[PDB]
Amino acid sequence: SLKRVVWALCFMGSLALLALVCTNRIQYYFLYPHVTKLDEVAATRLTFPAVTFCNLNEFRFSRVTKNDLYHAGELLALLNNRYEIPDTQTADEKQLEILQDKANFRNFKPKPFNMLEFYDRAGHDIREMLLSCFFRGEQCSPEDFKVVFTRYGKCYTFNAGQDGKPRLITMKGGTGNGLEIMLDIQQDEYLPVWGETDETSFEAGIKVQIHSQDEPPLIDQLGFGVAPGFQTFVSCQEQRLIYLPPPWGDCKATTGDSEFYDTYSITACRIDCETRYLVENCNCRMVHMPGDAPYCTPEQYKECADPALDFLVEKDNEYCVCEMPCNVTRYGKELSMVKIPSKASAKYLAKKYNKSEQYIGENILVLDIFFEALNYETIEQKKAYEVAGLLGDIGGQMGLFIGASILTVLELFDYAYEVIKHRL
Amino acid sequence: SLKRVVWALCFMGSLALLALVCTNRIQYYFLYPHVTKLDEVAATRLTFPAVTFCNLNEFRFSRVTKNDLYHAGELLALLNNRYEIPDTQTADEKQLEILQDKANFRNFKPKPFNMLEFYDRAGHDIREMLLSCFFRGEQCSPEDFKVVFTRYGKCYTFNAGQDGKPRLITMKGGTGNGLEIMLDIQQDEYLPVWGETDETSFEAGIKVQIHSQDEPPLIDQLGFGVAPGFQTFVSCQEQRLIYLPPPWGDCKATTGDSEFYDTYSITACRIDCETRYLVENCNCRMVHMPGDAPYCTPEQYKECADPALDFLVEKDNEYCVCEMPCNVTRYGKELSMVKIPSKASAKYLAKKYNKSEQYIGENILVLDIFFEALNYETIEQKKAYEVAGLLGDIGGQMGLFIGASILTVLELFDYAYEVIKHRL
Amino acid sequence: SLKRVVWALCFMGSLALLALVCTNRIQYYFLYPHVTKLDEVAATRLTFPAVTFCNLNEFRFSRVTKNDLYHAGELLALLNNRYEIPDTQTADEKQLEILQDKANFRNFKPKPFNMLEFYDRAGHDIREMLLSCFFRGEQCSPEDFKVVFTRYGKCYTFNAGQDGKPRLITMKGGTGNGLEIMLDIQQDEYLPVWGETDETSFEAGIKVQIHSQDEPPLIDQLGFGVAPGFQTFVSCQEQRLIYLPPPWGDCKATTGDSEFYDTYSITACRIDCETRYLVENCNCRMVHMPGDAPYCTPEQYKECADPALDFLVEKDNEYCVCEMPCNVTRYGKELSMVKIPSKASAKYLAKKYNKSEQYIGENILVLDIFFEALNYETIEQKKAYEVAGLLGDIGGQMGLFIGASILTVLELFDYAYEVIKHRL
Ligand SMILES: *[C@@H]1O[C@H](CO)[C@@H](O)[C@H](O)[C@H]1NC(C)=O
Ligand SMILES: *[C@@H]1O[C@H](CO)[C@@H](O)[C@H](O)[C@H]1NC(C)=O
Ligand SMILES: *[C@@H]1O[C@H](CO)[C@@H](O)[C@H](O)[C@H]1NC(C)=O
Ligand SMILES: *[C@@H]1O[C@H](CO)[C@@H](O)[C@H](O)[C@H]1NC(C)=O
Ligand SMILES: *[C@@H]1O[C@H](CO)[C@@H](O)[C@H](O)[C@H]1NC(C)=O
Ligand SMILES: *[C@@H]1O[C@H](CO)[C@@H](O)[C@H](O)[C@H]1NC(C)=O
C-alpha cells in the first residue's frame, strides 16, 4: 500500500505544480503582452513628406485697413478696450502715424466682415516670401505650395498631395537632393509691439512642422522653430510605426469616418473634436477649424470661444477621446545650422534682391530638408503570446507533469459514466 | 528481432535529438534573455519636469572683494602664483583699475572665509536674471526657483518639488502651455579673461539640464547649452523606462539608502561615491557635494581634492560601482531656435528694461520648455523566457520525441525497484 | 456503437483543431520573426569616435593660379563657357582685379595637371584652421589630423585610427573630457560668387560628420552643419547595433572583401560600387573615390562622369546592391549652441590671433564633442522563434489534442505493416 501511496502523493504534487504553472501562463496570457520589432528597410523610392510652415507674424502690417481695425482690432492686440491705440511710448514716427491715421474712427461706415478675408489679405504673400525654391536640383514654383489656416494664421504647405497632385518622391540622399528653400520672414512687416501682453511674441523667425500627407498640420503643438540668418539642415528619418488594436494595443482600427477628414489621424480627431465642441457652443467656428459652420465677428472669439477652449482643455478632458491609429508614419528630425550669408555671398544677394546687407543679415533663412539615408525604420508591436503558443505551453506542461491529454480527460468522463450506473 | 531493433534505433535517435534540443533550450534559459516593449501611453495630467540652469559664469565680477581674492583668488584664475594680477595686456581701463584697486594687498587683515559665502554673494542674483517668468500663461515668481550649487557654482531650479512643494503639472501641449522664461546672462559681469588658461571659457550663454525631481542635477555631464539672442523651443518627451533586476538586467532594486539622498538615482550614487572618497581623503568636501563635512579654504582644492579626482577618474574606477535604478524616467529633448528680438520687438524691450538695443541683441535669451504631446513613451524590459515557458517547451519536446512524462520516469524507478530485488 | 462514435467524432475535431494551430505555428515560423533587445551597458573605457569635417568652401581663393583656372576653371564655376570671367556686377576692387589678372590667358603655356595637386594646394591648411586643439584637457596637435578627400574636397579627420595609430579613448564624461577644437573657417578666402549657379553655396560654416574608425566618411549625405560664432556642444551616445543574417535579417555576414576597403561598411559598398561603375565608364575616377585608376582633367568630369552619376542614381539603381553589416556601431548626437565670444572674451582673442573683433565675431567656431555618459546602447535583433521552440510548441500541441508522439506514429506504421500482409 505504501509504494502506491508514494506514487499517489507524487501524482498529487505533480498535479499541483501543473496547476500552478498553468495559472501562471494563463495570467500571463490575459495581460495580452506585446513586444517590439525594429527594422531598417532600405528602399529606392521614398515619398517626400509634406512640409508646412508659418511665419511667426500672424499678418503683415501694411495690408490692414481702418476697416480691419474697426471690426477686428479688439482681439488682435491693436485697440484698447475703449477703441483707441494702447500705450505707444517710444514709437517710430511713420509707424505710429500710419496707425493713428487708421485710428481716427470718425464717421466710419462699417464693412461686411469675415476673418477669412482678413487672414487672406493681411497675411504674408508666399510670392513675397519664397525667394528661391529648389527640389532635387529642379526649381519648384511658388504656385506649388498650398494655403492652409492655423492658429498662427495663413500658412503654407509644400508637397501637400491634395487636389489630386502626386506625392513627390526623392531618389537620393544628401542636402542637394532635398527641399532647399530660401525665405524672407519680412521683419519690417511685423506687428507694433508697443502694447503690453503676456502673449507678446518678441521673437522673429519661422515655425516649420514636417508631417505626412495624411494628417493636417498642428504647428502650435508640433512644429519646431527656425531662426533667420542660418541655413538649417534638417535630417529626416521616416519611421513607419504599426501599433496594435485593443486588447493588445490602443488603435482606432476602423477607417475613422470623421466629419471633416476622410482620412484618420490623431490630429484630425483632435481638431474635429474641438470643432464639434465649439459648433455645439458658439454656433460658429474658428478659422483653423474646418466646418460648414460660419466664422464669428471677433467679439465672439474673445467672448465665447476662448473660455470654451479653457474649460475644454481643463474640465472637458473627457469630451475628447482620441485613439492613435495603427499605421502611423512619423518623421524623426535632426537640426543643424550654418550661418548665411558669408562675407562673399552677401553683396550678390544684396544686389540680387535690392536690399541692404543688413536686410540679408537679419531677414533671410534657408530651410533645407532632406532624408539622411534612403531607409525607413519600422517599429512594429508584435503580439508576444498568441493563443497558439498558449495551447502549446499548456499542452507541453500537461504532457510533462500528468502526461494526460484531452482524450484522457474524455475517457475519464466515460470511466465516470461507467461508474454513473452505480449511483442510479 | 530486426523490426524491434529498428524500433529501438529510432528510439535512440529520438532520445538523442530530444537531449540536443533540450540542452539548446536550457542553455537558452540560463542566458536569461529579455526583450523590449515600447509603448506610447497618453494621459491628461503630466508632471512637469524639473528645470535646472547655470549661467556659464561662475560668479559676477562686481560682487567680489579684496577679501575674496585674498583667500580665494588662487584657485579662481585671478591671482598669479606669487599673489599678483596675471598678464593683463590690452585691458579695459576701469575693468583693470578696479582689479588693481583690489590688488594692493597691503596691510590686509584676513577674513574668516568659506566657499559658500563666496558662491552665495559673488554669484548671480536670480532677481537680476529672471526678466519674465511664465507657466501655462500664469506668471511665476523668482522666489519659486531653488538655489543649488554645482561645479559651475550657484545655479537655479524650477519645479524642484522639494521643501514640500507640489510638483507642477501641465494640462496642454504646445509652446504656450509650458515654461517660458526670459533670462539675462549679464555679459558685463563675466570674469576678466586676460589671463591664459586651458579651461578659459571663451563662450557666453547658459547651460540647462532637464531632469526629474528624483535626481540631483549633473549639469557638467548632462546639460545642453542655450545661446543668448534666441528663443529656444525645447520639445520634451517623457520616457518611463523600467529595467530589470539581476540576473536578467542590472538594477539596484533596493531603495538605495545613500547617506545624503533618501531617494536613489544614478547621479546620486555618483555624487555620494565621490563625496565619500573625498571625505576619506581631504577631511573636507567640495561645494557641489553634500555632507556634514566642512568645506576647505581654496588651497586644499588645488592642493588635495583635484588630484584625488584625477586618480579617482583614472585609477580608482573600481572604487565607485553604480547600478542603474529600475523605474528611471528620462526626458527626450529636441532643440530649435528662433531669433529674438525682431526689428519691431527691440525698442519695446530697450525701453522696458532700460538697456541699449545692443544689450538686448547680445544679452537676452528666452528658454522655452514644453511637452510635444501629452503622452509618455514606455521602454520596459520584459523577461523573454521565464521558467514556466521553459517547463512548457521541455514538456512539449519530451511529449513529442519519447512521449514519456515524469510519471513515466517515476514508474521507471519503480520498475527498477522491482528489478532491484534481483541484485540483492 | 454510439458512445464510441462520439469518442471518434471528438477525436476527429481534436485532430482538426490540432492541424489548425499546427499550421498556424508553422506559418508563424517560416516568416522568421525577430524581436528587439535594448540595453544600456556602462563601461569605463570607450573608444572615442572619429571626427571628420569639411569647410564649406572647396578651396581657398588665394592659392589658385592662372594654371589652375586654365585647366580647371571650367568645372569649378570660375570661367564662362568661352573661357572668360562670368557676370561680375557689383564686385570688390582687388577681388576682381586679382581674378582679371589671372584672366589674361594670353600666350599661356599649359601645365601638366591633376585634380589632386589642386585640391592639395588650393584647399585649406589645417595649420591655418586649427586654432586650439584640446582632448581630455591635453593639447592635441595639428599633425594628429588626417587628410581625406570628399566631394567638398580636402577635409580632415581626428582620431582616424589609420596608419597604425591607437584609437583614442575617453575616461570621463562632460564637456571638459572630450574633443574641444577652435576653428577658423576663413570667410576671406571663400569663392567669388558673382556668377550665378543653382548650387551656389551662399552659406558659410563647417560640416562635421561623426563616424567610427571602420567606415570612410560620407559627409555629403551624413554630416551636420555647424555655424561660426557658436561653441557647439555635441552630445554623443554610442550605439552598438547587431542585426541578423538572412533569412531573419539583412546582413552581409561575410568579411566584405571589397576592392579598396578591407573592412566592410555600408558606405564602403556605396563608394566602391560607384567607383567600379565609373571606372567601367570613363576610364578614370573622381577624387573622393579610391582606386588605382587615374583621375581626369576636368572636362571629363562635366563631360562623362556626372551624367554617369545621374543615370546611376536614376536608372542604374539595380547596379548597386548594398547589404547593411551585422555589428554596426552608430553615434547618436544632440546639438546645442552657446554664443562665442562674450563681451569679455573678445579682446583677448583679437589680441591673441591678431584679428579684428569683427573677425572673431563672424569667423570662429568651437566644435565640442563629448559623450553624454559612459554607456553604450545595444540594439540587438534576437531571433524570436527558433526551431527548438517550434518543436516544443508542436510537441505540446500534439501532447494536448491527440496525445500521440513520434513513437506512436512509428508504431502506427508498424501496425499498418502487420496489416500490410493482408493486402498481399
Ligand atoms: C496602413 O498599413 C498597411 C499595412 O498594414 C499599408 O498597406 C498602408 O499603406 C498603411 N497606410 C499608411 C497611410 O501608411
Ligand atoms: C530697388 O529698390 C529701390 C528702393 O527700395 C527702388 O527705388 C528701386 O526702384 C528698386 N529697383 C528695382 C530694379 O527693383
Ligand atoms: C517606480 O516604479 C513603480 C512601478 O513599478 C511605480 O509605482 C513608481 O511610481 C515608480 N517610481 C518612479 C519615481 O517613477
Ligand atoms: C535707467 O538707466 C540709466 C543708466 O543706466 C540710469 O541713470 C537711470 O536712473 C535709469 N532709470 C530707471 C527708471 O531705471
Ligand atoms: C562585431 O561583432 C562581434 C560580436 O558579434 C565583436 O566581437 C566585434 O568587435 C564587432 N566588430 C565591430 C567593429 O564592432
Ligand atoms: C599683425 O597683423 C598685422 C596686419 O594683419 C601685420 O601687419 C602684423 O605684422 C602682424 N603682427 C604679428 C605679430 O603677427
Whole-number Cα distances in Å, A74 to A78, A80, A117, A302, B255:
6, 7, 17, 9, 57
What is the rounded distance in angstroms from the CA atom of residue C239 to the CA atom of residue C40?
9
Paired with B55 in beta bridges are B206
Grid cell 571629363 in the structure block, residue: C300
Nearest CA to ligand 5 atom 2: C327
| Cell numbers that stand for B140 in this block | 511665476
Answer whether B35 sits within 8 Å of A34, measured CB to CB: no
Q: Is there an atom of ligand 5 within 6 Å of C159 CB? A: no
Question: Where do the DSSP E strands lie in B304-374?
Answer: 327-339, 364-371
Q: Are residues C21 and C69 in the same domain?
A: no
Reference C185, options C110, C240, C117, C131; nearest CA is: C131
> B277 and B320 in contact (C-beta within 8 Å)?
yes
Q: Can the peptide bond before residue A216 be classed as cis, meaning omega within 30 degrees of 0?
A: no
Reference C363, options C67, C84, C56, C105; nearest CA is: C56
Whole-number Cα distances in Å, C202 to A137, A180, A325, A362, B149:
15, 12, 42, 15, 45
| Cell numbers that stand for B418 in this block | 522491482
Reference C236, options C212, C265, C268; nearest CA is: C212
Contacts of A407 (CB under 8 A, 6+ apart): C10, C11, C14, C401, C402, C403
Reference B366, options B123, B136, B173, B130; nearest CA is: B130
The best mutation among A244, A255, A324, A327 to test binding of ligand 1, ranked by most ligand atoms within 8 Å of the C-beta, falls on A327
Domain extent for C117: 57-124+186-205
What is the rounded distance in angstroms from the CA atom of residue C168 to the CA atom of residue B342?
45
Give distance in angstroms: CA of C371 to centre of ligand 3.
Answer: 28
Answer whether B399 sits within 8 Å of C394, measured CB to CB: no
Q: Is there an atom of ligand 3 within 6 Å of B306 CB? A: no
Half-sphere exposure of A209 (CA within 13 A, CB side): 26
Nearest CA to ligand 1 atom 8: A327
Reference A237, options A117, A419, A47, A376; nearest CA is: A376
Paired with C208 in beta bridges are C53, C224
Contacts of C13 (CB under 8 A, 6+ apart): none
Answer whether A35 sits within 8 Å of B40, measured CB to CB: no
List CB contacts (< 8 A) between C402 and chain A: 405, 407
Residue type, A404: A
List CB contacts (< 8 A) between B337 and chain A: 205, 225-227, 337
Search chain B and give the residue with CA nearest A202.
Answer: B345
> C62 and C189 in contact (C-beta within 8 Å)?
yes
Pick from B36, B203, B306, B333 the residue to mutate for testing the C interface (most C CBs within 10 Å). B203
> C388 and B25 in contact (C-beta within 8 Å)?
yes
Grid cell 527548438 in the structure block, residue: C388
Which ligand has its closest atom nearest to the C-alpha of A359?
2
What is the rounded distance in angstroms from the CA atom of residue A251 to the CA atom of residue A241?
12
Number of domains, chain A? 4
| Cell numbers that stand for C345 in this block | 572674451
Q: Is there an atom of ligand 5 within 6 Å of C380 CB? A: no
What is the rounded distance in angstroms from the CA atom of residue A207 to the CA atom of residue A212?
17
The whole-angstrom distance between B145's CA and the closest CA on chain C is 23
What is the rounded distance in angstroms from the CA atom of residue B132 to the CA atom of residue B142?
9
> B264 and B256 in contact (C-beta within 8 Å)?
yes
DSSP, residue by residue, A260-307 = S-SS--HHHHHHHHHHHHHHHHHSS--TTS--SS----THHIIIIIHH
| Cell numbers that stand for C300 in this block | 571629363
Contacts of B196 (CB under 8 A, 6+ apart): B86, B87
> A41 and A376 in contact (C-beta within 8 Å)?
yes
Q: Are residues A211 and A172 in the same domain?
A: yes
DSSP, residue by residue, A138-190 = B---GGGEEEEE-SS-EEEEES---TTPPPPEES--TTTTSEEEEEE--GGGS
Nearest CA to ligand 5 atom 9: C327
Type and span of the H or E element at A209: strand A206-211
Burial class (CB in 10 A: 0-12, 13-18, 19+), C325: buried
Burial class (CB in 10 A: 0-12, 13-18, 19+), B242: middle
The best mutation among C327, C377, C380 to test binding of ligand 5, ranked by most ligand atoms within 8 Å of the C-beta, falls on C327
Question: Where do the DSSP E strands lie in B159-314?
Answer: 169-170, 179-184, 206-211, 224-226, 230-242
Whole-number Cα distances in Å, C313 to A139, C258, C310:
19, 21, 5
In terms of DSSP bridges, do strands C230-242 and C375-383 run parallel, antiparallel, or are they unpaired? parallel
What is the rounded distance in angstroms from the CA atom of residue A317 to the CA atom of residue C148?
58
Q: Is there an atom of ligand 1 within 6 Å of A380 CB? A: no
Half-sphere exposure of B400 (CA within 13 A, CB side): 27
Grid cell 570621463 in the structure block, residue: C172
| Cell numbers that stand for B58 in this block | 561662475
Beta-carbon count within 10 A of C345 CB: 21
> C258 and C269 in contact (C-beta within 8 Å)?
yes
Answer whether C402 sits within 8 Å of A405, measured CB to CB: yes
Question: Where do the DSSP E strands lie in C263-413?
Answer: 327-339, 364-371, 375-383
Instruction: Name chain C's partners: 3 or more CB pairs within 8 A.
Output: A, B
Residue type, A177: N
Burial class (CB in 10 A: 0-12, 13-18, 19+), A145: buried
What angle is formed at CA B359 by the lines to CA B353 and CA B363, rounded to 5 degrees?
100
Q: Count interface pairs B-C at CB distance under 8 A.
A: 183
Search chain C and give the residue with CA nearest B61.
Answer: C344
Residue type, B195: G
Q: Is there an atom of ligand 3 within 6 Å of B327 CB? A: yes
> C139 and C133 in contact (C-beta within 8 Å)?
yes
| Cell numbers that stand for A63 in this block | 495690408
Q: Is there an atom of ligand 5 within 6 Å of C329 CB? A: yes
Q: How many residues does chain B have?
A: 424
Whole-number Cα distances in Å, A182 to A122, A132, A204, A346:
22, 5, 16, 14
Type and span of the H or E element at C231: strand C230-242
Nearest to A399 among C200, C226, C399 (CB): C399
Nearest to C338 among B199, B205, B398 (CB): B205
Q: How many residues does chain C have?
A: 424
In terms of DSSP bridges, do strands A327-339 and B34-42 run parallel, antiparallel, or are they unpaired? unpaired
Cα-trace Rg, chain A: 32
Q: Are residues B264 and B238 in the same domain?
A: no
Residue type, A59: F
Grid cell 576592392 in the structure block, residue: C259
Q: Are residues B76 and B197 in the same domain?
A: yes
> A44 and A171 in contact (C-beta within 8 Å)?
yes
**Biggest CA-to-CA distance, chain B:** 117
Last residue in a domain, options A326, A352, A370: A326
Q: Are residues A223 and A154 in the same domain?
A: yes
Which ligand has its closest atom nearest to the C-alpha of C245?
5
Nearest CA to ligand 1 atom 7: A327
Backbone angles phi, psi at A188, to 5 degrees: -70, -20
Nearest CA to ligand 1 atom 2: A327
Query: Which CATH number does the domain housing residue C403 bear?
Result: 1.10.287.770
What is the rounded distance in angstroms from the CA atom of residue B44 to the CA atom of residue B23?
49
Q: Is there an atom of ligand 1 within 6 Å of A214 CB? A: yes
Reference A160, options A125, A117, A209, A194; nearest CA is: A209
Answer whether B338 sits within 8 Å of A226, measured CB to CB: yes
Q: Are residues A156 and A221 in the same domain?
A: yes
The angle, 0 to 180 degrees and rounded to 10, between the axes of the packed helices B387-400 and A2-29 is 120
Reference C37, options A239, B379, A31, A248; nearest CA is: B379
Nearest CA to ligand 3 atom 3: B327
> A377 and A240 in contact (C-beta within 8 Å)?
yes
Burial class (CB in 10 A: 0-12, 13-18, 19+), B279: middle
Beta-carbon count within 10 A of C186 CB: 21
Answer whether B395 sits within 8 Å of A394, measured CB to CB: no
Grid cell 535517435 in the structure block, residue: B13
Q: Give the determination technique.
A: cryo-EM
* Resolution (Å units): 3.7
Tell me, what DSSP letter sits at residue C138?
A: B
Q: Are residues C362 and C339 in the same domain?
A: yes
Reference C298, options C113, C155, C112, C58; nearest CA is: C113
Contacts of B161 (CB under 8 A, 6+ apart): B50, B167, B213
Nearest atom (ligand 5) to Cα of C263? 13
Q: Is there an atom of ligand 5 within 6 Å of C55 CB? A: no
Q: Are residues B93 and B118 in the same domain?
A: yes
Nearest CA to ligand 1 atom 1: A327
Q: Are residues A97 and A157 in the same domain?
A: no
Q: Are residues A214 and A347 in the same domain?
A: yes
Query: Which CATH number does the domain housing residue B358 bear?
Result: 2.60.470.10
Tell me, what DSSP letter sits at residue A61?
A: S
Answer whether C335 sits within 8 Å of A336, measured CB to CB: yes
Tell me, what DSSP letter sits at residue B402?
A: T
Q: Are residues B256 and B347 in the same domain?
A: no
Query: Which CATH number does the domain housing residue C68 bear?
Result: 1.10.3590.10
Q: Are residues A104 and A29 in the same domain?
A: no
Nearest CA to ligand 1 atom 11: A327
DSSP, residue by residue, B92-155 = -HHHHHHHHHHT---S-------HHHHHHHSS--STTTEEEEEETTB---GGGEEEEE-SS-EE
Q: Count interface pairs A-B at CB distance under 8 A.
A: 183
| Cell numbers that stand for C367 in this block | 566644435
What is the rounded distance in angstroms from the CA atom of residue B365 to the CA atom of residue B345?
14
> B374 and A210 in contact (C-beta within 8 Å)?
no
Q: Is there an atom of ligand 5 within 6 Å of C214 CB? A: yes
The whole-angstrom distance between B112's CA and the closest CA on chain C is 31
Answer whether C401 sits within 8 Å of A398, measured CB to CB: no
| Cell numbers that stand for C249 in this block | 535579417
Dihedral angle sign, alpha carbons of residues B150, B151, B154, B158: negative
